[PDB]
């Protein structure tokens, strides 16, 4: 009932299981159900420069004629340098989180400048998203993929590296706005048994669930590990796709529904 | 297409997901940014009681200004429950309800700060708290802010109710700063085995001391966010947080001096 | 002459009757003459939730095909709670004003998220917001209806309740921009001889002037009483209509110029 | 079901239009937020006179910093008259000219604040003044701001000249804060029966003391906004506002000590 | 009627390009806004060395807080070189690379300010530095800001590398304020006849004393921006700037007391 | 008690007539951090309860 929910909301703690169960029965509204969130890799794509960014810009300009895109940017090697300096000083994860946000901001600015003449803007208030996505002439926005947690960043179990970075920032935006899919555009064909750059016998994994993926005990992954837990708790985005942006057409085929690369399912 | 342009750094080329590769660089305990800071979280439901509760607390806070360097953070209260009722009726997701509830915590902060304006206390914004708290606590003895964290549309999914609320945000701030402590000001004496105002209040037994891990294994309701117990497990500095009754004058003053007048929650932080 | 106006502007106080009369003869430019400002009620509409908001969202999306809309939001019961807490503490009207603005901000954010998929955005447009109003794909914006007076709010003759709230905020927007219409969308057919929720005996008033409305000595009204004085001093919006948003089509018919509720005229 | 979802409060369900229903809750006199504050309004026409007037005023203000906690608010002056000339020529409405004139008041504030920078004085913005004045006056002895209120496009219609200008905005702030006083610094000795620089100067008689009501019933020009007299009728704290000549050194200092050196304007507030 | 509507002023009607018409009004030397200010510029490459260089610098800065009123400005460092590498590879113009490099200077400022937070030091933003430095240096003993100027897309064209960098921005601020001095903290002893870490490092000889005019006519690399020498030629207050090695503890402290421990750069200021 | 103590025996006598202070902690100053902890009310030494009965 709504009467039951409204009575619990005013008389009980928000931690009350009865209130939590009543709120779970509420209707589910998707804010941008026809939109797709994509992450342009930071260290994996944008840090490669023109040879990787320019073909993807062409693919994005072509893809936006058919698909509404929220284009999030990674951070990359400049964030790792900032993390190294700050970690050497013993600064907490909340301070490192703000430093990493600036790097993703830089990448969003550089990508947006290459898309400005195509009408695609760099947005960052929340408010500029509605007009350009609706316009078929635009149909896309660029945003910085770092979460807004800042000094309120939840620290990892060990170390000062912020556990929620540009993978989580992009995914949570896709989940919050009820987008239909989340595509990570990086520099490998997908998830492997191990880091393919340092493990030469790594095997490509075309599809896996979060439970099976955590069962593998991977030493390294193409996505932030906390995103796997966010994926299992997600209400709208119940799977993510990882594709190789260095191969032309991979992003377009993923938007068309092809299972290019790796699909990681929550269930 | 062509090679990644790296900046030479101890974390260069790394994905940062390999704990064995990141530990030599970042695996150490962080420093304390503001070790002399005391953080006080005022419950939204305490503010909801109006002048009958706010005026005595304002007088107690006034007498505490010459004794401590205070960051005062306010919770949301009943008004966030109404925006939840409307927002959930409209079907809005959890990342939509989080900033709407935070707004009520901010309004409570403006109200509390106005009562202390003649003492030099003002409400300060989240970016000011995150980056300029040191200079503001050098200008005046205390500032007021919103206890909610700026998670916004990046709030965690799962529950339709935002999990990172006022208790959680206040502790994330206090522990990130390495503050001397966090005191949570409640409308009850502390944590009980059941809701002391609910249908099973006859069974409610007061808990003078508890651990965050023991509370996280509970299932019943609590006067603090369940996410607070989660961030307490990964805390770095604050070893204990006391929940005291702000409706009893003197308990906040006693708690800031380490006196046991409420429920002591042991975090996961350790040693001498 | 403009030469005498410019001369008086440089040699006289702005309080000089000679200067005031010369300025009153200046040309009258309407910034948004084709736009209409509507207020979506706070306590009367948005506080009712899905049963009231969802039908009006569909009506707004259909109506923007034919009419330019600036959609202001009321505050409602959460503002009354804030006013009660602050009044009990003896806080002045200027402090209560900022508290109420947050509630209208909340309602604007909730309405905007339901309209985001239709391209209609929430605006804080400092220099107006010409782009979204100009586009036939959008043709509408959502704004928070509280005036910006904040601590500079003029207090009422008695009490600390801010006398200029979301009714005045939306009306002054229509007046400043020279909009062709101002429509208050609430939960009653219009103005009654008394509060229809507390007086079973109230009689619907289809049309009344400000002078006639003041002569009746109303104890309560569907609009803020100071708006009646702003209406009589207005240069562009010389009348308003209050309509029942709980009846589908009332907003659309009022936008087309139909008399479906109460029309309050300055003269 | 489509009923209104209410928050339980003493003002719930009602419109706030029924003064009989709101009086039991909000019909009381407000408290003073900054009772120790002195507000000084500097006329824009005084700033227009340049260094010949600004330098002696800066020296007087410098010597006042160890004596009072000052909120200095600057008027607009002749430059606002030009943007009125251009704006009215373009036909812009009164809500368009209000922020345009306010910009000149803010620029006068930046000019005055720069001259006092070596004493720790800086210009602060309206949101800073409205919410964080207490902390700023704890950091330094005085701050400068724009005397114009942020009415903007929500300025009242009726006249093509914005009514809520520097005098009115400064008084709204001083009375809302419950400040110890408001002093208006003019380029004349005070209020006369006619323009002491106008066509009928020969008959202008100096008014040492007057009421806001008597001036509101007056016909003809004044050195203060007519809207100032209107907000004085609804004032809650400030009982008198003195208009003094800033071109005479020492009169501002004397007025801040309550000495009668100009025109005293009696508001609608009576003592207790 | 189409005439220009003028405001009567000493500079009215004229274009401000006729130097003979503007000199009687504005041709004099400006006043000092903050004569007691000491500006310290920390090189980005010094911050790039990490805790080995930052921890001793923080300890030296900590001991300097009770001695001087410090505006601490941080440079960009190696991370700006990477955003240049990616930006130039993408073909971006100089006005796009300027804010990107400035971001790294801001991040260095947040890092340094965090280490001094326990002393009341915070990072402040450029609008705060431009308009409210005086009140912030009254609240606390020192503030940290980005040394890059907010030139952004209005950066000067000609070079594909932004010319107005950290040294230039720091001097522009210090000279505009009329500060008591500007000290540049480098990772080398000062200016050499060649790059002491470059391919011709065997030819490099230390220059204890230089002039900005002679350095500007020089060709080859310098440890400071070449635009710094250009703005030194038009400087109004600061007569000399010293470049000292921040990797040697005590040299910053000595330079702030006027002791010659690095390279002195004589500006175009000779007050005669 | 009879025998030596690390505090004056007169301290115990004036604690009996104390009016405000309810407890005094004796901590080891040769261990860094214990003074800081004791000032925050943390039990890191010997707590001496005075004659002031807490409410
Ligand atoms: N185990 C428990 N122990 C103590 N109180 C409980 C428990 N479970 C529920 N409660 C109830 O929770 C209430 C406190 O509510 P809550 O914590 O939501 O308010 P708040 O903390 O003031 O608000 P906010 O979190 O917005 O600051 C108490 O009055 C009590 O009745
Ligand atoms: N009754 C009056 N008494 C005194 N002065 C008057 C009167 N009527 C007009 N004036 C004129 O008004 C002038 C002051 O103008 P005004 O008040 O507009 O400037 P200001 O207050 O400095 O500017 P701002 O309001 O922008 O701060 C005086 O020089 C005087 O000549
Ligand atoms: N003529 C010169 N004299 C001294 N050093 C030089 C000279 N030419 C080049 N250099 C080199 O420049 C280095 C300093 O680099 P740079 O000035 O770019 O860094 P920074 O000033 O710390 O950074 P930022 O300008 O971003 O603050 C020195 O280590 C030195 O090797
Ligand atoms: N198990 C794995 N499978 C695939 N890629 C992996 C794995 N472990 C590590 N990686 C590496 O992670 C990289 C992507 O992560 P990262 O470098 O953080 O890019 P981004 O900055 O775009 O997030 C890939 O280049 C890949 O080499
Ligand atoms: N004379 C009257 N005629 C019609 N409605 C009235 C009158 N007096 C009071 N009202 C009430 O005022 C309400 C609208 O005002 P309000 O509660 O402030 O809603 P909103 O938030 O839309 O301003 C209506 O629900 C109506 O019951
Ligand atoms: O809900 Mo309001 O503040 O009366 O418009
Ligand atoms: Mg990554
Ligand atoms: Mg609680
Ligand atoms: Mg209303
Ligand atoms: Mg005047
Ligand atoms: Mg020109
Ligand atoms: Mg250098
Ligand atoms: Mg002893």
């Amino acid at each position: 009932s709504t009467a039951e929910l409204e009575e619990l909301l005013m008389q009980r703690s928000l931690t009350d299981p009865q209130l939590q169960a009543a709120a779970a029965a509420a209707a589910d509204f998707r804010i941008l159900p026809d939109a797709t969130v994509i992450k342009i890799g930071g260290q994996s794509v944008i840090d490669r420069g023109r040879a990787a960014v320019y073909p993807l810009v062409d693919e994005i300009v072509a893809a936006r004629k058919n698909h509404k895109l929220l284009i999030g940017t990674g951070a990359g090697t400049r964030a790792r340098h900032l993390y190294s300096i700050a970690a050497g000083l013993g600064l907490p994860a909340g301070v490192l989180a703000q430093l990493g946000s600036s790097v993703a901001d830089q990448n969003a600015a550089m990508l947006g400048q290459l898309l400005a003449k195509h009408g695609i803007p760099v947005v960052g208030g929340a408010g500029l998203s509605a007009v350009p996505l609706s316009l078929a002439e635009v149909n896309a926005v660029v945003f910085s993929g770092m979460p807004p947690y800042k000094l309120w960043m939840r620290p990892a179990a060990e170390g000062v590296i912020p556990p929620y970075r540009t993978d989580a920032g992009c995914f949570l935006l896709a989940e919050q706005f009820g987008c239909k899919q989340m595509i990570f555009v990086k520099d490998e064909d997908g998830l492997y048994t191990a880091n393919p750059k340092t493990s030469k016998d790594a095997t490509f994994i075309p599809r896996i669930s979060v439970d099976e993926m955590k069962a593998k005990g991977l030493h390294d992954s193409i996505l932030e590990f906390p995103v796997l837990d966010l994926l299992q708790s997600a209400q709208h985005v119940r799977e993510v796709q990882v594709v190789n942006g260095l191969v032309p057409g991979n992003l377009t085929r993923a938007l068309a529904g092809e299972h290019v690369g790796t699909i990681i399912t929550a269930s | 297409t062509n090679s990644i342009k790296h900046v030479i750094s101890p974390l260069a080329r790394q994905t940062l997901q390999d704990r064995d590769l990141t530990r030599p660089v970042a695996g150490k305990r962080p420093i304390r940014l503001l070790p002399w800071l005391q953080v006080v979280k005022i419950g939204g439901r305490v503010m909801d009681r109006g002048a009958d509760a706010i005026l005595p607390l304002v007088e107690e806070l006034r007498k505490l200004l010459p004794e401590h360097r205070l960051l005062i953070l306010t919770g949301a209260g009943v008004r966030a429950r109404h925006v939840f009722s409307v927002g959930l009726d409209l079907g809005l997701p959890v990342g939509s309800l989080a900033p709407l509830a935070a707004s009520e915590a901010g309004q409570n902060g403006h109200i509390l700060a106005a009562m202390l304006a003649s003492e030099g206390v003002s409400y300060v914004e989240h970016p000011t708290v995150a980056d300029q708290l040191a200079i503001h606590l050098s200008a005046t003895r205390a500032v007021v802010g919103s206890a909610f964290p700026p998670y916004h549309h990046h709030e965690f999914p799962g529950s339709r109710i935002p999990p990172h609320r006022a208790d959680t945000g206040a502790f994330l701030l206090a522990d990130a700063f390495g503050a001397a402590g966090l005191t949570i000001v409640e409308n009850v004496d502390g944590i009980y085995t059941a809701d002391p105002n609910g249908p099973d209040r006859g069974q409610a037994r007061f808990l003078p001391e508890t651990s965050a891990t023991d509370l996280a294994k509970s299932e019943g309701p609590l006067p603090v966010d369940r996410a607070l117990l989660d961030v307490m497990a990964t805390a770095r500095h604050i070893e204990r947080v006391q929940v005291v009754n702000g409706l009893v004058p003197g308990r906040l003053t006693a708690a800031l001096r380490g006196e046991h007048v409420g429920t002591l929650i042991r975090t996961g932080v350790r040693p001498a």
Side-chain angles (χ1 to χ4, degrees), chain A, chain B:
Chain A
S1 68
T2 292
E4 181 87 40
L5 169 63
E6 290 183 355
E7 186 218 73
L8 294 172
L9 276 172
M10 301 286 228
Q11 291 298 321
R12 308 289 191 82
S13 168
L14 290 176
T15 70
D16 198 302
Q18 274 191 247
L19 182 152
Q20 291 279 336
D28 184 15
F29 180 80
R30 288 175 177 256
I31 298 171
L32 300 174
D34 293 318
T36 285
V37 173
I38 66 172
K39 171 180 170 178
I40 301 302
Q43 184 172 240
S44 65
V45 172
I46 295 180
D47 281 346
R48 297 179 175 267
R50 178 197 210 89
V53 170
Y54 265 47
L56 278 177
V57 162
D58 294 348
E59 194 155 353
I60 284 168
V61 170
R64 62 96 172 260
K65 303 183 201 213
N66 295 136
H67 308 275
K68 284 171 172 52
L69 306 174
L70 286 93
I71 309 161
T73 56
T77 184
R78 290 191 309 276
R80 275 141 190 81
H81 184 272
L82 274 160
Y83 299 157
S84 302
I85 298 290
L89 294 161
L91 289 171
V95 169
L96 274 77
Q98 313 194 60
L99 304 174
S101 191
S102 174
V103 178
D105 285 352
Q106 293 168 310
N107 291 340
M110 289 192 289
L111 177 58
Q113 274 163 40
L114 301 171
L115 297 164
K117 70 187 191 175
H118 301 280
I120 302 174
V122 174
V123 299
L128 309 197
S129 180
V131 161
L133 287 174
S134 73
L135 298 173
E137 310 94 303
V138 184
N139 230 44
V141 303
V142 179
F143 69 95
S144 181
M146 201 67 182
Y149 302 155
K150 265 143 91 143
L151 204 56
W152 296 261
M153 167 76 56
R154 292 181 61 151
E158 271 226 310
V160 305
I161 298 297
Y164 301 97
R165 302 180 305 280
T166 57
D167 284 339
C170 285
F171 172 80
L172 285 170
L173 202 152
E175 156 72 8
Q176 146 72 4
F177 293 129
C179 303
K180 58 174 177 179
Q181 72 190 149
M182 169 75 233
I183 302 175
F184 293 93
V185 181
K186 309 216 177 185
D187 66 339
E188 301 289 345
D189 291 343
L191 177 72
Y192 282 72
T193 42
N195 195 321
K197 290 186 176 63
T198 59
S199 276
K200 316 318 147 143
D201 302 329
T203 299
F204 166 72
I205 301 172
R207 184 180 180 88
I208 195 163
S209 76
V210 168
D211 279 355
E212 296 162 317
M213 186 168 170
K214 297 167 94 184
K216 288 207 159 279
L218 304 171
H219 298 10
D220 209 348
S221 165
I222 203 160
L223 298 180
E224 293 157 25
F225 280 103
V227 174
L228 302 182
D229 294 316
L230 296 172
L231 176 55
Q232 281 197 320
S233 310
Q235 313 293 290
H236 308 117
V237 185
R238 299 295 294 169
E239 69 176 47
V240 298
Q241 188 167 19
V242 184
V243 306
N244 195 339
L246 305 181
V247 173
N250 265 4
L251 170 62
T252 300
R253 294 190 260 271
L255 293 168
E258 299 190 27
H259 277 178
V260 179
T262 296
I263 296 284
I264 299 170
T265 67
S267 295
Chain B
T1 43
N2 255 38
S3 316
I4 304 172
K5 306 170 192 301
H6 297 282
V7 176
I8 296 169
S9 85
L11 292 174
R13 301 172 191 272
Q14 284 197 39
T15 72
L16 303 174
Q17 332 293 354
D18 197 326
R19 304 191 210 71
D20 285 332
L21 299 179
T22 64
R23 174 184 296 112
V25 176
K28 65 222 201 93
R29 173 143 270 150
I31 57 145
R32 294 177 186 261
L33 293 179
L34 300 177
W36 40 260
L37 171 65
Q38 284 285 354
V39 185
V40 175
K41 184 259 167 172
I42 306 296
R45 297 272 202 177
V46 174
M47 301 290 299
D48 289 340
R49 300 178 73 102
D52 285 358
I54 292 167
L55 291 184
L57 173 82
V58 163
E59 288 312 312
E60 182 158 9
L61 286 168
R62 187 191 318 277
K63 294 162 181 163
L64 288 167
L65 300 180
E67 191 180 347
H68 306 286
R69 325 275 300 274
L70 292 174
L71 172 66
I72 309 166
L73 303 174
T74 49
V78 67
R79 284 187 313 273
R81 311 301 190 90
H82 178 269
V83 85
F84 288 168
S85 172
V86 174
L88 289 168
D89 199 48
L90 300 173
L92 298 185
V94 66
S96 292
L97 303 182
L100 299 167
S103 290
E104 310 295 351
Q107 298 325 291
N108 282 331
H110 285 269
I111 288 167
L112 186 56
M115 303 306 297
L116 290 159
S118 63
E119 302 289 343
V121 178
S122 293
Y123 182 87
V124 297
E125 314 281 2
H126 278 154
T128 293
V129 177
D131 293 321
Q132 284 101 13
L133 184 58
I135 182 171
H136 289 72
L137 287 183
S138 303
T140 193
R141 290 298 294 188
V143 298
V144 184
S146 163
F148 266 66
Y151 275 40
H152 308 148
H153 308 139
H154 292 79
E155 177 65 284
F156 289 13
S159 170
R160 295 301 296 272
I161 304 298
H164 298 99
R165 299 191 294 275
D167 306 312
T168 306
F171 184 85
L172 285 165
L173 256 194
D175 197 59
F177 279 131
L182 165 71
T183 302
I184 293 178
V185 172
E186 212 77 20
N187 64 3
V188 290
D189 290 339
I191 303 182
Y192 292 73
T193 54
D195 191 349
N197 297 313
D200 293 78
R201 79 206 69 174
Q203 181 257 110
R205 163 181 142 257
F206 180 72
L207 300 178
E209 191 168 337
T210 182
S211 72
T213 54
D214 277 353
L215 290 178
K217 294 161 59 261
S218 296
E219 295 214 289
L222 296 172
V224 292
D225 308 340
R226 293 213 151 260
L228 165 66
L229 320 169
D230 294 328
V231 301
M232 275 178 172
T234 60
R236 305 292 207 259
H237 296 298
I238 305 185
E239 302 177 4
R240 69 197 53 78
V241 172
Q242 191 166 189
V243 181
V244 303
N245 197 334
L247 306 180
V248 178
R251 292 205 174 166
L252 172 59
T253 300
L256 289 171
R257 298 166 183 168
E259 302 178 1
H260 191 187
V261 295
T263 290
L264 283 167
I265 309 170
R266 282 191 307 276
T267 75
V269 172
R270 307 152 296 312

